[PDB]
Design a binder for this molecule. Structure first.
Ligand SMILES: CN(CCCOc1ccc(Cc2ccccc2)cc1)CCC(=O)O
Ligand SMILES: [Cl-]
Ligand SMILES: [Cl-]
Ligand SMILES: [Yb+3]
Ligand SMILES: [Yb+3]
Ligand SMILES: [Yb+3]
Ligand SMILES: [Yb+3]
Ligand SMILES: [Yb+3]
Ligand SMILES: [Yb+3]
Ligand SMILES: [Yb+3]
Ligand SMILES: [Zn+2]
Length: 608
């Protein structure tokens, strides 16, 4: 069982039990400097060396037992970084624990971090920093066994300019002026539940909070606090349903942080402090399924964890499954099926983009020599969800399958597991239905590329109007355009508008006159909901509407969520009228983008 994304000693050799991080955030140099004190437990007799992951770190010294020890940094291995071998001064027996204190500093180019200037923030006065460690970027902040097969507690003390606030994936443990530098404050944190290191997170900036529930504050810059408090007001109700489905919430608080617009993802389930994109701020709570998803990771992902990234679908398929149950409890079972069916549509799109034989469309992936960020897609989410929804249907329905989910989280809490571990437990739980389980084509579901071998059954009540309208547009000829009118949308929710657009985008391009008519009668240009806007602008660009070029360039650059930015840049590059400007725009913005987004957009555009 091999973590092919890590160069560190594996969990079978030694295990980090605790990190004590003491660091200072230097905005003048764009570096984090400090010490990482790792409490390491040997798993072997006579252990005399170990290896940690690092990426673009400068190591000053390694101290054990109060003295400097020998270490060596190996050659860089591309996106994995450089292995750090530490020679232990005294051979360790099995189960012996020592503390290794590594003095280090990050590089400004750290792929875990984005350093924003004051002009890149809402308030325009102060800079801002945020991290994003998942999958294998923690090594670009501190030396570590950067593998989700190891779980550790942590404590931290972070020095920052005194006008700023630090927060971490941990419980706040006080603040004081920095005695070393009165222009600074030290913020302290403690995470007493063991976590994989991809869940370590840090933000520093001009942050304000507002309480929105009995265990929830929302944090943002001042300009976003009121909108965010309204947008995410369902959080407590979602936590209550999640706790009913998953068992106890063990993390103390569930806070939310609304990042600046360059955050590359919709959300990140950092324990105690979920991070979200401000593209969720639609004004009507309609994108709150992302919060339901990050809440659900407090069980599936953060308590039961994938042992290696090849098994990422265990984290995501189960979290999407729980997410859609939270949705269904709030808004009904027909809505759960609507979202499920939509997810199948997204899986169709992903499979068609990679190609039906591509290895990144397998459920269990093999990441040997693959940069995880190049493989990331909706496949583990939606092929994983589809497998669980198919099992739900085969095994007697949602109440029965929810019994398995709660038992699964209980069984594997605080552990890191593989697909075979999950499957073994599925068979144990459902021992009286083994014949039905043995009917599943496990090799195809888990290991074959392309769409799954069987499509679940979906209620189509809320989808039918979306399909009907889409088909009217696709099949319309010029003489039918006059028949469309704003009234066509009167009984469609924002969810259904989005699904109309997704169905139509699957057949794009449409004739340019059709798209012009759509704007004339439906005024989709006026919709600010990021999901609808994204799909509408893709439809416009793929249908060769030059007027949409500046709108798509603006959306691709004024926020940085990769879900939106990557396909908008790719569509702009494929449209001959926008190609040159798309490339100039990327090269203009390159240096001030998130490092991972910058990398991926470059690859997508074929621009170095
Ligand atoms: C922000 N976060 C994603 C960060 C990127 O994480 C990964 C995690 C795993 C991979 C490797 C992988 C990619 C595709 C299929 C299996 C495995 C690549 C990137 C998602 C948060 C969430 O799901 O709630
Ligand atoms: Cl490196
Ligand atoms: Cl036309
Ligand atoms: Yb020294
Ligand atoms: Yb305390
Ligand atoms: Yb200090
Ligand atoms: Yb077994
Ligand atoms: Yb078994
Ligand atoms: Yb006609
Ligand atoms: Yb520009
Ligand atoms: Zn997730």
């Amino acid at each position: 069982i091999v973590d092919t994304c890590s160069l560190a000693s594996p969990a079978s050799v030694c295990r980090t039990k605790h990190l004590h991080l003491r660091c200072s955030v230097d905005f003048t140099r764009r570096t984090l400097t400090g010490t990482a004190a790792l409490t390491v437990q040997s798993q072997e007799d006579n252990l005399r060396s170990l290896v940690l992951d690092t990426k673009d770190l400068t190591i000053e010294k390694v101290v054990i037992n109060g003295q400097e020890v020998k270490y060596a940094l190996g050659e860089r291995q591309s996106y994995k970084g450089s292995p750090m071998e530490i020679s232990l001064p005294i051979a360790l027996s099995k189960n012996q624990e020592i503390v290794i204190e590594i003095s280090f500093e990050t590089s400004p180019k750290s792929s875990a971090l984005q350093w924003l200037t004051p002009e890149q923030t809402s308030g325009k006065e102060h800079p801002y920093l945020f991290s994003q460690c998942q999958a294998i970027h923690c090594r670009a902040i501190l030396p570590c066994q950067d593998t989700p097969s190891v779980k550790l507690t942590y404590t931290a003390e972070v020095s920052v300019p005194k006008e700023l606030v630090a927060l971490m994936s941990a419980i706040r443990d006080g603040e004081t002026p920095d005695p070393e530098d009165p222009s600074r404050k030290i913020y302290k944190f403690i995470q007493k539940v063991p976590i994989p290191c991809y869940l370590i997170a840090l933000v520093v900036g001009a942050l304000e909070s507002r309480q929105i529930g009995p265990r929830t504050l929302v944090w943002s810059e001042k300009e976003q606090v009121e909108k965010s408090a309204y947008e995410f007001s369902e959080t407590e109700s979602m936590l209550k349903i999640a706790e009913d489905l998953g068992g106890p919430y063990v993390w103390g608080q569930y806070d939310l942080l609304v990042l600046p617009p360059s955050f590359p993802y919709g959300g990140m389930e950092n324990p105690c402090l979920t991070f979200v994109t401000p593209t969720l701020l639609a004004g009507d709570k309609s994108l709150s399924n992302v919060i339901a998803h990050e809440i659900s990771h407090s069980w599936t992902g953060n308590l039961v964890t994938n042992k290696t990234w090849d098994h990422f679908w265990l984290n995501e398929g189960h979290t999407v499954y729980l997410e859609r149950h939270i949705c269904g409890r709030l808004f009904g079972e027909k809505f759960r099926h609507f979202n499920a069916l939509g997810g199948w549509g997204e899986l169709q799109n992903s499979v068609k983009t990679f190609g039906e034989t591509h290895p990144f469309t397998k459920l269990v992936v093999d990441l040997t020599d693959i940069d995880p960020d190049v493989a990331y897609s909706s496949v583990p989410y939606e092929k994983g969800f589809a497998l669980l929804f198919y099992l739900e249907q085969l095994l007697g329905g949602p109440e029965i399958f929810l019994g398995f989910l709660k038992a699964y989280v209980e069984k594997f809490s605080y552990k890191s597991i593989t697909t075979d571990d999950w499957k073994d437990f599925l068979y144990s739980y459902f021992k009286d239905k083994v014949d039905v389980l043995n009917q599943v084509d496990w090799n195809a579901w888990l290991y074959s590329p392309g769409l799954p071998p069987i499509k679940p059954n979906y209620d189509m009540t809320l989808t039918n109007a979306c399909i009907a309208l889409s088909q009217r547009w696709i099949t319309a000829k010029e003489d039918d355009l006059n028949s469309f009118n704003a009234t066509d949308l009167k009984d469609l929710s924002s969810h259904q508008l989005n699904e109309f657009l997704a169905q139509t985008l699957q057949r794009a391009p449409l004739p340019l006159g059709h798209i012009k008519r759509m704007q004339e009668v439906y005024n989709f240009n006026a919709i600010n909901n990021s999901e609808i806007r994204f799909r509408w602008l893709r439809l416009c660009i793929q249908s060769k509407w030059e007027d949409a070029i500046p709108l798509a360039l603006k959306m691709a650059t004024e926020q940085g969520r990769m879900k939106f930015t990557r396909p908008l840049f790719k569509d702009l590059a494929a449209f001959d009228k926008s190609h040159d400007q798309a490339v100039r725009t990327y090269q203009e913005h390159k240096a001030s983008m998130h490092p991972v987004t910058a990398m991926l957009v470059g690859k997508d555009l074929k621009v170095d």
